[PDB]
Design a protein around this nucleic acid. Structure first.
Ligand SMILES: [K+]
Ligand SMILES: [K+]
Ligand SMILES: [K+]
Ligand SMILES: [K+]
Ligand SMILES: [Mg+2]
Ligand SMILES: [Mg+2]
Ligand SMILES: [Mg+2]
Ligand SMILES: [Mg+2]
Ligand SMILES: [Mg+2]
Ligand SMILES: [Mg+2]
Ligand SMILES: [Mg+2]
Ligand SMILES: [Mg+2]
Ligand SMILES: [Mg+2]
Ligand SMILES: [Mg+2]
Ligand SMILES: [Mg+2]
Ligand SMILES: [Mg+2]
Ligand SMILES: [Mg+2]
Ligand SMILES: [Mg+2]
Ligand SMILES: [Mg+2]
Ligand SMILES: [Mg+2]
Ligand SMILES: [Mg+2]
Ligand SMILES: [Mg+2]
Ligand SMILES: [Mg+2]
Ligand SMILES: [Mg+2]
Ligand code: NA
Ligand code: NA
Ligand code: NA
Ligand code: NA
Ligand code: NA
Ligand code: NA
Ligand code: NA
Ligand code: NA
Ligand code: NA
Ligand code: NA
Lengths: 69, 191, 144, 151
RNA sequence: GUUCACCCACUGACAGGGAACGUGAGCUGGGUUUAGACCGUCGUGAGACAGGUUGGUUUUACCCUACUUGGCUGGAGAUUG
RNA sequence: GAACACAAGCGUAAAUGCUUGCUUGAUUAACGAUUUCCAGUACGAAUCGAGACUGCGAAAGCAAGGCCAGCGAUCCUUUGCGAAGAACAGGAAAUAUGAACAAAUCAUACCAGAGGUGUCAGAAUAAUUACCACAGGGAUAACUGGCUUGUGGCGGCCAAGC
RNA sequence: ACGCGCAUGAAUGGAUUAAUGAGAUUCCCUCUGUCCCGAGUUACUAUCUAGCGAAACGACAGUCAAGGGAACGGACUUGAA
RNA sequence: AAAUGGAUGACGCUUAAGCCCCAUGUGCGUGAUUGCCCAUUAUUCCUUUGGUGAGGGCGGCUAUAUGUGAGAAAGUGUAGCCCUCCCGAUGUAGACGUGGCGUGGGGGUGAGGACGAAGCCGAUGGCGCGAGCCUCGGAUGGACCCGCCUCUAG
RNA sequence: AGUUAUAACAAGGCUGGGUAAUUGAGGCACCAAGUGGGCCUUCUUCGGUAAGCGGAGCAGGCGAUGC
RNA sequence: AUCGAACCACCUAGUAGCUGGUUCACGUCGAAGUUUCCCUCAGGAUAGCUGGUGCUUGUUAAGAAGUAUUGUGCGGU
RNA sequence: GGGGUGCCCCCACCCGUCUUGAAACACGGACCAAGGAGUCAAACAGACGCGCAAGGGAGGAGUAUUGUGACAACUUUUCUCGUACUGAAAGGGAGGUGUGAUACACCCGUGGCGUGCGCAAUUUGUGUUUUUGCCCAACACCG
């Protein structure tokens, strides 16, 4: 016995029950894994220097406050 | 009639009573329900909300995590100020990986026996929640902490182990029957 | 208890939560793990990707007693000593002696910050554990 | 259900134009792309290499990767009850700079200019007023135009 | 076996249809359509054929209504005011 | 308005066509990323890259097949890589195991291909039943009824002709 | 009788045969209620009484016409008894 | 032009009760802006139930014998601690909740019975939205049985 | 330690100054049921002489619902 | 009184994607007949629709909208 | 006020089921009593309650007892799960900051960045510190 083949009826109603969720924000999953390697490798060396400078800045800020107290 | 197109899908699941059978918990709930509704302190309203949570949603904290968080705060204190009181709605457990802590004042639902010995031996105090309401109503000079939940074994099983970029641990009965070669494995990353 | 089951709630509903159209029948999909490669393929591939196939070498007559080797880290060495001994000894003083075989350990791994110097007797040791315990003022004595 | 390949409904989509055939000019070659820009994805159909799928023709997205002869763009795409952020790699010929933010940027430039001048407007037709015709005609639906609509 | 058709006669005339292709607890059982058996063609075979041939159980009404006859007896606020 | 192996579409003129010269980018490519089908799984196909060694060019540059259709899991079988030396010790550098230990064969593992499943997400497969059986199906035929009226039947309108 | 026989034919036996057959078919004589076209009579029933005394079946029930309806209603709508 | 007698629903209707349009109370070329009928709809009032609910009271000194009087629990859920206010209420397959109902037996606690237990009967009424509970009568019976908290199930 | 023959570009940071209507709760998980025969109508449509016929696109319904 | 394989007891409560049945009340919510794969088409697995449990937060909008405006792209009915 | 019987005007297709669709010319339906269908075990997962917590818990056995006695009490574990993972295997095995190119020296401690309950300190509502839990993106260390 034959039957139905295909229909898109009721599918738009189902998709909007819980809505079409908005896309993820642009700041959420932003990793350049497969990109241009020469630029990726260079950015790592800059980031390592930024982390080292961040640690040094907190050391001087803490020492200055302790001297005042 | 009314439209009511998205009215039902906005309701939040909110519970106003505790499933616990402990009568000492119910005495604390009664005390902080009174304080929450009569002092307009956001601290007191938070404590009452957390006392109604289930055991799974009140994770334990470690003594080492308390000592590190306390030090990161008190190092910026002024000349004449005093260290705050750490408050956890949950259990405090001892950590054998620190062994050297300053004097701490901690209020919690429960202390393990070893944790109580280490705190008292260092010069600190263990407090009950009825002691905190007695000496620090409205929660002045307090530090509120929660405790970790992301390291649990149940969380590691969430998801599907066979989809690209998953890193989910499968539910394995026979460990040797689910080994798989180094090749034929799913892709480890996906954008 | 039988009085807490769903059967007590379903007295008078005639279907017990199985529907009028597709009823409650016996084995509509096969018995056990049947059809794991034919009509249950998506479930197996999604959740148990390593089920089908072989991997690695074999080992007849395993005898698990020959590979007994529990490990303990340098960070947990305090739990094997008395409470007073942890703070009693430092650097050039007399140090407590810990024997790992009595406590049920074989290999000493070095992870984390060592609290107090001590003398540890072990069967196996690590590269990092050896270096860290030596700097702190302790030593490792090999056992058998 | 038969014959759904990579280029199914593309007879008129990838056709070039009338009297506008050829290959990309120098102005296209000299365009500069940098990460964070907005671009439009349109096919060229004279460059077979790096041509995107038919779904992404006419879509607008942001660039996340710059390569020696290619650009990577992030494009939204609704699937069932959600939109997926997709990444496509195309050649620089099938990519054009987007002008979807020039009005916004011009608004910002005007605001700072107005503040800069202040540191150193329009006529509403909606409101009423007097009207002096000096002449008035009449519309009357003459019988002549009824006879006109006879081919 | 037929419905159909075709011949022989009479007649004023020998029109066409419907009623669950009216009518099987009204009949009959020639046909169709089990099991036996023969022929032709087909099949290696068991067997097949809307091809031919011969033989092959037709069950129950005393119930309700309808219809046909047969009798008894109420009733005008159509049983009451 | 020609040609570009083949079906069709798109595309192309000092070329993507034709002739000619030289060549082997149809190799290898550290598990890089992505698109199409899509469950956002696999397979097939395709796009953008990093490294080695190269080809053609004076150069910029183009090329890891012939643009898009032309192909294949588990288990099993079979082939290739783990050349020779250097290390007082398994290390940034020497493939591993056969479990009491040694010498030489043999077998087995780890990585990359090949032998195929066209019912192409992949059981190893000939008939007959009128002597027939069971669970069901009005999800599905043969007879009544229902919609339709091609065909069948019965009639109008115009008027070239008889 | 005739034979270009869809597709007759020789122990997958061909042709022919007296006698025999609860075997299949056609015609003739005799005979008749098979029929034209039905009528009368008998015995046992049915029918009434005395004695005795079941079953099948049983949603609920039981007057029609048209309509619509799961496209043929006892129940529904309108009408008529 | 068709097959049982029969359908603008029927009767009937022709200064329509037919077809196409136009109006409206008391007063239709002098009251400009509602002729009238029918809903599980709308507005409004009362009651119930559930909330992503919103507010308020709860430290009991005003004075009072009998021959103006009763309550007030810091609370999810009950005979709801009490008083105001706002918003929703239908539903097959299906999910969940209930100091929700009922039955046999165990551990506790408190009662009942020869001045009549269980069982049985009913124009016996009362209470609850309901599952049900309780009183009454027997011109029934003649020896056991129940309320509440928990545990358990043929 | 990226580009350019080098001022200049890329990329990651630190320290000071100024900054499109009208409706309204945003985001993230875990566990599991039924279902996987549909049918009708508006408009757009393919096959068929046509069908209360077969097959699709958009939307609303019945199924699940009375009044 | 049993035969296209007798009767008796046992394995045996044989298996059935198929037919039939499945016992109290009120309350809060409430669908699907569609996608991919399967010797798959009267059945399953998988996603979607639904319920329960929540977590993190907020008090005018955070990563809000089956709707408009302005600007700027796409198309061959 | 409740209960019983009759009457009047109005309203009102037969229950259960499969099905897109049942009042059906679809199936099961004479009446009553008593029976009659999601149970027990074992492995795993999630929610909720309880004890303890870098540890948790035994089992089998044994010690002491007509007594509510097949109950109840008692016994760095002797076993198991976990605190460490990784490779086919031989095997190996995870702290921070600073300074140099089994390196060296210290140990009151979040590797750095972003969004982040509450608390602390300022201005008259704003800006700031520490940020818990969670999430995103870059290091580093182990195989
Ligand atoms: K290259
Ligand atoms: K098989
Ligand atoms: K004979
Ligand atoms: K189901
Ligand atoms: Mg279907
Ligand atoms: Mg239901
Ligand atoms: Mg169910
Ligand atoms: Mg089912
Ligand atoms: Mg008859
Ligand atoms: Mg033959
Ligand atoms: Mg190809
Ligand atoms: Mg049918
Ligand atoms: Mg012969
Ligand atoms: Mg012959
Ligand atoms: Mg004889
Ligand atoms: Mg009739
Ligand atoms: Mg309801
Ligand atoms: Mg019993
Ligand atoms: Mg249905
Ligand atoms: Mg059923
Ligand atoms: Mg609802
Ligand atoms: Mg049907
Ligand atoms: Mg019915
Ligand atoms: Mg009918
Ligand atoms: Na075009
Ligand atoms: Na197949
Ligand atoms: Na016709
Ligand atoms: Na005709
Ligand atoms: Na009428
Ligand atoms: Na079905
Ligand atoms: Na059985
Ligand atoms: Na198959
Ligand atoms: Na069925
Ligand atoms: Na049936």
């Amino acid at each position: 016995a034959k039957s139905k083949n295909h229909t898109n009826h009721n599918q738009s109603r189902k998709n909007h029950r819980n809505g079409i969720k908005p896309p993820l924000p642009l700041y959420m999953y932003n990793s350049k894994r497969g990109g241009w390697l020469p630029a990726l490798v260079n950015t790592r060396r800059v980031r390592k220097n930024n982390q080292k400078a961040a640690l040094k800045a907190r050391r001087e800020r803490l020492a200055a406050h302790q001297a005042a107290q | 009639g009314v439209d009511l197109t998205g009215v039902q899908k906005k309701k939040r699941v909110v519970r106003h009573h505790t499933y616990s059978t402990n009568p000492y918990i119910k005495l604390l709930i009664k005390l902080y329900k009174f304080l929450g509704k009569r002092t307009n302190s956001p601290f007191n309203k938070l404590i009452h909300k957390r006392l109604l949570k289930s055991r799974n949603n009140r994770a334990p904290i470690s003594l080492s995590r308390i000592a590190v968080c306390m030090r990161r705060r008190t190092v910026w204190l002024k000349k004449g100020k005093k260290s705050p009181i750490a408050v956890i709605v949950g259990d405090v457990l001892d950590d054998v990986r620190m062994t050297r802590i300053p004097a701490l004042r901690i209020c919690a639902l429960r202390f393990s026996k070893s944790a109580r010995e280490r705190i008292t031996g260092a010069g600190g105090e263990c407090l009950t929640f009825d002691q905190l309401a007695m000496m620090a109503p409205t929660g002045k000079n307090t530090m509120l902490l929660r405790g970790r939940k992301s390291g649990r074994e149940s969380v590691k099983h969430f998801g599907a182990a066979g989809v690209p970029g998953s890193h989910a641990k499968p539910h394995v009965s026979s460990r040797g029957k689910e080994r798989q070669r180094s090749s034929k494995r799913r892709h480890a990353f996906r954008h | 208890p039988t009085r807490f089951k769903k059967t007590r709630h379903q007295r008078g509903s005639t279907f017990c939560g199985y529907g009028r159209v597709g009823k409650h029948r016996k084995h509509p999909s096969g018995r056990g793990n049947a059809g794991g490669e034919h009509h249950h393929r998506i479930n197996f591939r999604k959740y148990h990707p390593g089920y089908f196939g072989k991997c690695g070498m074999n080992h007849y007559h395993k005898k698990k007693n020959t590979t007994w080797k529990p490990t303990i880290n340098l960070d947990n060495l305090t739990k094997l000593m008395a409470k007073d001994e942890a703070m009693k000894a430092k650097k050039g003083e007399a140090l407590p002696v810990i024997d790992l075989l009595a406590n049920g350990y074989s290999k000493l791994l070095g992870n984390g910050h060592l609290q107090a110097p001590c003398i540890v007797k072990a069967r196996w040791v690590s590269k990092l554990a050896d270096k860290k315990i030596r700097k702190a003022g302790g030593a490792v004595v090999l056992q058998a | 259900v038969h014959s759904h390949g990579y280029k199914c409904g593309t007879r008129h989509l990838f056709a070039k134009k009338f009297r506008k055939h050829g290959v990309p000019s120098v102005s296209t070659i000299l365009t500069n792309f940098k990460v964070g820009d907005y671009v439009d994805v349109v096919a060229d159909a004279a460059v077979r290499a790096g041509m995107p799928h038919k779904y992404y023709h006419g879509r607008t997205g942001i660039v996340w990767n710059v390569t020696p002869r290619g650009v990577g763009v992030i494009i939204n795409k609704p699937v069932r009850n959600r939109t997926v952020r997709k990444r496509i790699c195309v050649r620089f010929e099938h990519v054009r700079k987007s002008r979807c933010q020039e009005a916004f940027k011009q608004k910002l430039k005007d605001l700072e200019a107005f503040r800069a001048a202040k540191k150193a407007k329009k006529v509403s037709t909606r409101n009423g007023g007097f009207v002096c015709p000096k002449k008035v005609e009449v519309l009357a639906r003459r019988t002549a135009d009824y006879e006109a609509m006879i081919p």
